[PDB]
Structure formats: C-alpha cells, structure tokens
Design a protein around this ligand. Structure first.
Ligand SMILES: Nc1ncnc2c1ncn2[C@@H]1O[C@H](CSCC[C@H](N)C(=O)O)[C@@H](O)[C@H]1O
Ligand SMILES: [Zn+2]
Length: 161
C-alpha cells in the first residue's frame, strides 16, 4: 500500500536527499531546511547513527568534549541514545525549537527501530526544520541557553557550545 508506514519508509530511503539541504541556521550554527514544499505528516529524514546505552553515551560525550568538535545525539528513551557524532547523517544538524515543525517518531522496519523526523504541518521550501529536543527537568543532563526565538521559548535546552 502506497501510504503504509513501511512503504513511506521505503520511499524515504530514496527521497530524503531531495527533502532537505544543509545551510546556515536562523537559530544556531548549521541547520537543516526543506528543499521543497513538504506535506504534513510526511517522513522527512531519518536520524541515523549508532544506538548505544546511557553509560556508553556519557563516556562518549566526555571523549568528544575533549576534542574541538560538535556532539550529535538523539535520546530515544531512558535506556538508549542514538549517537550521530561519528556515523550520523544530515538529520543531526536539525536544531531544537520550543515551537517546532517536525516530530521524531520511532518506526520499526525489517526488525529494526528507527527514528524518523516527520513534519507536523506543511512546511514550505526554504523553511528551517526543527523538532523539540525533550529536555526533562529531572537532572540527567546539563543545559545551555535556548536561542530558538519562539514566543513560548523555555529559554533553556539540553546541549553544548
Ligand atoms: N534553539 C537552539 N538554541 C540554541 N542552541 C541550539 C538550538 N538548537 C540547536 N542548538 C545547538 O545545536 C546543537 C544540537 S545539534 C544542531 C546542529 C548545530 N546547530 C550545529 O551547527 O552543529 C546543540 O549543541 C546546541 O548548542
Ligand atoms: Zn527556545
């Protein structure tokens, strides 16, 4: 079926290169933009990387912090993180917004769990892609100023300089 989840994912693997482009962000550093008008609830790009445990992720983040380099991770849940720092794709440049246009959802395809960035509304060509990073207050991580610039911006987020 053309509109099934598995078919959407299969189309994603061939189309994602045409959905997005990397450019200077209107938020911070580099960001990811819609290369074309994207319909609502459409799969945009997969957050690829290496699935690791919290223990492993915290040890990696220390390693990275000692280098002059960005850290690129997506937390799936309390147990696992996708580390995109070494093996990620352009989805790792997607910035946080307190008022985002995309959502990240787990999708299972041929025996694997995947994080797919999905539009939560129509996105015009040239608009920056964002999702909400999901920083819970219960300690866990550090936190930096948020510069997403939205009206309801919580002024803080999880991350690094
Ligand atoms: N709304 C926002 N406000 C401030 N910093 C942000 C942000 N969204 C993303 N970032 C920064 O981007 C990182 C997440 S990865 C996003 C890619 C990053 N902009 C880059 O050019 O490499 C975090 O370390 C954070 O510092
Ligand atoms: Zn914000």
């Amino acid at each position: 079926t053309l509109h099934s989840k598995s078919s959407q994912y299969r189309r994603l693997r061939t189309e994602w290169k045409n959905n997005v482009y990397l450019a200077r962000s209107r938020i911070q550093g580099l960001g990811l933009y819609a290369a074309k008008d994207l319909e609502k609830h459409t799969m945009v790009i997969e957050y690829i990387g290496t699935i690791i445990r919290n223990e492993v992720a915290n040890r990696r983040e220390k390693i990275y912090e000692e280098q002059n380099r960005g850290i690129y991770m997506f937390r799936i849940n309390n147990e696992h993180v996708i580390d995109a720092t070494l093996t990620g794709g352009p989805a790792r440049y997607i910035n946080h917004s307190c008022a985002p246009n995309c959502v990240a959802e787990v999708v299972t395809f041929d025996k694997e769990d995947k994080i797919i960035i999905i539009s939560s509304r129509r996105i015009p060509k040239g608009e920056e892609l964002t999702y909400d990073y999901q920083f819970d207050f219960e300690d866990d991580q550090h936190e930096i100023p948020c510069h997403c610039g939205a009206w309801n911006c919580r002024k803080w987020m999880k991350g690094h300089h």
